[PDB]
């Protein structure tokens, strides 16, 4: 709920135990804002951290060798973690369980440190999370309180704070200039409207926002300027697959009352809300 940072780097890790045999499946993904740049998949054949953005291919063998050595270390930790949590909650070997970890950093406009975070989850439920001061932990469970005690004694937060306020910030700053054309971009949404006659006394007006970045978007339907927070159908923002995002909203209007209705698009690249009408 706090203020947005100008930019953010985030890493997402998922381990899924596969009982029977085979090491659990491990996926690592790194984001700069809403742009993926790194991948590691245990089921993939490379067995290395791979680029998924052109501006990160610049980095030479020392970068990739280092990330590949450290991404497999993450893998190993969650292999131990998956066994620890199955012993913490006392569950059989036969069950398939999931471990999720995410950490990263935000910077303000000045590109200096603003916020850091590092959170775990077991089977979708919040487990352990590092506090906002980067000095204490929040346990969502009495089992996660055991990890809280183990980590507070080992001074784990001091090492994580070193990364969040240090390596995280400086290397995100470097990614921002290495990929200015992609990461420091603002794509204003392309907008249009469609009309579909539901029946004789009703029609649907769908308000389209396409090809925008970042993903943060607000579409709202109004009649006579009054927000129709109810009686409007909104869909979750989806990726177009080309590095831009899409969203639309629809409302059912009585025939002959279209002119009374306005759609509005609010985006980073629009200083004032953009008004959309029905005009064939």
């Amino acid at each position: 709920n706090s203020v947005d940072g100008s930019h953010s780097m985030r890493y997402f890790f998922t381990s899924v135990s596969r009982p029977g045999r085979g090491e659990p499946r491990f996926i690592a993904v790194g984001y700069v804002d809403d742009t993926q740049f790194v991948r590691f998949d245990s089921d993939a054949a490379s067995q290395r951290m791979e680029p998924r953005a052109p501006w990160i291919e610049q980095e030479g063998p020392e970068y990739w060798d280092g990330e590949t050595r450290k991404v497999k270390a993450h893998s190993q930790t969650h292999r131990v973690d998956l066994g620890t949590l199955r012993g913490y909650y006392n569950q059989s070997e036969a069950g398939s369980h999931t471990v999720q970890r995410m950490y990263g950093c935000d910077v303000g406009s000045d590109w200096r440190f603003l916020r850091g975070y590092h959170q775990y989850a077991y089977d979708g439920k919040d487990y352990i999370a590092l506090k906002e001061d980067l000095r204490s932990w929040t346990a969502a469970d009495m089992a996660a309180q055991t990890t809280k005690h183990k980590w507070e004694a080992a001074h784990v937060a001091e090492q994580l704070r070193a990364y969040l306020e240090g390596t995280c910030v400086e290397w995100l700053r470097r990614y921002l200039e290495n990929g200015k054309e992609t990461l420091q971009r603002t794509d204003a949404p392309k907008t249009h409207m469609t009309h579909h006659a539901v029946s004789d006394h009703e029609a649907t007006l769908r308000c389209w926002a396409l090809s925008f970045y970042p993903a943060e978007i607000t579409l709202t339907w109004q009649r006579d300027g009054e927000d129709q927070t109810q009686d409007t159908e909104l869909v979750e923002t989806r990726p177009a697959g080309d590095g831009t995002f899409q969203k639309w909203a629809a409302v059912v209007v009585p025939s002959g009352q279209e002119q009374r209705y306005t759609c509005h698009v609010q985006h980073e690249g629009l200083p004032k809300p953009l008004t959309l009408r029905w005009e064939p």
Partner: peptide, 9 residues
């Protein structure tokens, strides 16, 4: 770049 240091639960 990802963090260098990992710790177990």
């Amino acid at each position: 770049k990802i963090a260098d240091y990992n710790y177990k639960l």
